Amino acid sequence: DRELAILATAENLLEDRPLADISVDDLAKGAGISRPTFYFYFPSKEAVLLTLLDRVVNQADMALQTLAENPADTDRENMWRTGINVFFETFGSHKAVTRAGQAARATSVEVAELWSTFMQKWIAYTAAVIDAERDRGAAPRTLPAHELATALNLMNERTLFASFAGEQPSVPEARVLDTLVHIWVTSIYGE
Amino acid sequence: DRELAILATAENLLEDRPLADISVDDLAKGAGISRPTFYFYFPSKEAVLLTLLDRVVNQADMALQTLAENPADTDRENMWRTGINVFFETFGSHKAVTRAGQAARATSVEVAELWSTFMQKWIAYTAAVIDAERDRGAAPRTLPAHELATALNLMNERTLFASFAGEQPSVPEARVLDTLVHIWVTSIYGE
Ligand SMILES: CC(C)Cc1nc(-c2ccc(C(=O)NCCC(F)(F)F)cc2)cs1
Numbered sequence: 001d002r003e004l005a006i007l008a009t010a011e012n013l014l015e016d017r018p019l020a021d022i023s024v025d026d027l028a029k030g031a032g033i034s035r036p037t038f039y040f041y042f043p044s045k046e047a048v049l050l051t052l053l054d055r056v057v058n059q060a061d062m063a064l065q066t067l068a069e070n071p072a073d074t075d076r077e078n079m080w081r082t083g084i085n086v087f088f089e090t091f092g093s094h095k096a097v098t099r100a101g102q103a104a105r106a107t108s109v110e111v112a113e114l115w116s117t118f119m120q121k122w123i124a125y126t127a128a129v130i131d132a133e134r135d136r137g138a139a140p141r142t143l144p145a146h147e148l149a150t151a152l153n154l155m156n157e158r159t160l161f162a163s164f165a166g167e168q169p170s171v172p173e174a175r176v177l178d179t180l181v182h183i184w185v186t187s188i189y190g191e
Numbered sequence: 192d193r194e195l196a197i198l199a200t201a202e203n204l205l206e207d208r209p210l211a212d213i214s215v216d217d218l219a220k221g222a223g224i225s226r227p228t229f230y231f232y233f234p235s236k237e238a239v240l241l242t243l244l245d246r247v248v249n250q251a252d253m254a255l256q257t258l259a260e261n262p263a264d265t266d267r268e269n270m271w272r273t274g275i276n277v278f279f280e281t282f283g284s285h286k287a288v289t290r291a292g293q294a295a296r297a298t299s300v301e302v303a304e305l306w307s308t309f310m311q312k313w314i315a316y317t318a319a320v321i322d323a324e325r326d327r328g329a330a331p332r333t334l335p336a337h338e339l340a341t342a343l344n345l346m347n348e349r350t351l352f353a354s355f356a357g358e359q360p361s362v363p364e365a366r367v368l369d370t371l372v373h374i375w376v377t378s379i380y381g382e
């Protein structure tokens with residue numbers, strides 16, 4: 001309620017500057033409440049970013065769970081594309097939260113642990129699907145599936161987020177999905 | 192001389208704690224000089240880390256230039272392995288400088304610009320070799336070479352450095368070279 005207003009204010013302000021330049025007073029004003037009233041909702045501006053990141057991470061996670069439960073009727077290249085696309089659209093639709101949440105991994109144990117927990121979950125699901133593809137005879141038994149899954153997930157983390165931030169260097173945002181799908185499909189199905 | 196002693200002290204202290212916990216006084220003592228004498232060599236402890244990172248980055252760069260000028264007589268999988276191995280051995284032999292240098296990208300424009308300049312150089316060289324492989328008919332014309340090169344370089348950055356830091360998640364350090372070579376070779380030569 002007022003919680004949603006604080007979160008919306010923070011996501012808005014993060015589009016024009018870093019969390020280090022946003023004061024508890026800034027978040028209070030945008031939500032139509034006082035500073036002490038802010039502390040009834042959150043202990044710190046750091047907790048507000050942790051909550052925004054938690055919401056975006058869980059949105060991606062539930063979108064991937066939806067795809068897992070509702071297999072698309074398409075070839076294996078388009079199957080992998082739908083999965084990568086969850087992360088491209090979810091994080092790419094919340095660039096300021098993505099940028100600030102990644103930066104906070106350096107200074108917040110809670111943000112680092114959240115990121116680590118979900119990356120472990122997404123890697124495990126990737127490996128399980130590679131294993132299923134090997135079990136059905138579509139993919140060759142090359143690298144250990146979990147190691148391959150880990151490197152492909154870390155590739156997507158660095159490459160998506162560099163593209164969203166317009167880093168130099170980066171893959172243009174309009175090319176990054178096709179780029180990652182190519183590398184996933186060749187490395188999963190290639191002898 | 193005393194410069195080399197300051198650099199060695201800093202690389203030593205970075206193995207047990209972050210630069211934020213190392214004082215100009217710490218570096219001065221280990222080099223056998225006073226604090227004001229330290230400032231004759233470097234303006235800041237941040238400049239000392241910038242110099243250590245510059246040395247390691249240039250070591251990798253010159254090792255890659257050496258391989259480029261002295262082609263190994265081996266198959267294309269071993270050719271790509273020798274190149275990735277430059278980064279695995281160079282950065283993997285200087286883990287504390289790697290970890291601290293990557294962390295400083297967030298707060299030092301000079302460190303960010305150094306990292307960006309060399310990543311651009313290594314990506315450009317990767318693309319030129321993929322192009323040569325396509326020109327000779329060994330690799331298929333799939334993705335734009337520069338986009339493929341960028342994603343493979345960013346994969347190696349995130350995956351090598353997570354492995355060196357023992358992040359969760361990470362590829363074990365003893366598996367990371369084979370993991371990356373597989374992904375490079377399948378994505379470069381795969382239809
Ligand atoms: C859904 C099925 C049909 C296809 C599948 N897709 C995935 C999948 C998992 C993780 C990521 C990813 O991009 N990780 C990195 C996330 C990031 F936020 F770090 F980028 C991409 C794809 C697993 S099984």
Ligand SMILES: CC(C)Cc1nc(-c2ccc(C(=O)NCCC(F)(F)F)cc2)cs1
Pocket residue numbers: 255258259270271273274275278282313314316317320343344345347348349351
């Ligand atoms: C030498 C020939 C025979 C094979 C070749 N190898 C490369 C090559 C370039 C960059 C990286 C890399 O790992 N970048 C990322 C660097 C990092 F420090 F970020 F990890 C790996 C391989 C280019 S042509």
